[PDB]
Amino acid sequence: AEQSDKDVKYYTLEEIQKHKDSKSTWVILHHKVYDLTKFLEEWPGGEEVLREQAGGDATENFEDVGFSTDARELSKKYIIGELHPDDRSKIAKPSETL
């Protein structure tokens, strides 16, 4: 009920690496995870381009596959939680993501 996830949700990068669906789509800037599954429904309407690399990056990457310069603030408002400090560094060089 009132765990840490009630405030800020604890994600693994490993979870996001299993990206073969539109709802299984998130991006990480460093140590926080963003809800990219809502973000794909906004402008591009095609998960495939950003879902293939869900969990790769957010910092500059949300603008690559997502929107124009809009993609900066539009992803930041979709903050879903934090990515685990060990997982972001574990799969820091992701094979089936980039």
Please report, for the domain that includes residue 83, its CATH number.
Answer: 3.10.120.10
Alpha-carbon span 20 to 48, nearest angstrom: 9
Nearest to 87 by CA among 51, 33, 35: 33
By three-state DSSP, how is residue 49 classified? helix
What values do phi and psi take at 8, rounded to 5?
-135, 120
Domain that holds residue 56: 1-98
Experimental method: NMR
* Domain tally, the chain: 1
Scan for tokens 């073969």, then name that residue. Answer: 20
Q: Which two tokens stand for residue 9?
A: 């949700």
Measure the CA–CA gap between 66 and 72, rounded to whole angstroms: 9
Integer Cα distance of 17 and 78 in angstroms: 19
In whole angstroms, how far apart are CA 4 and each of 11, 56, 60, 62, 98? Answer: 12, 24, 28, 26, 30
How far is 84 from 11, CA to CA, in rounded Å? 6
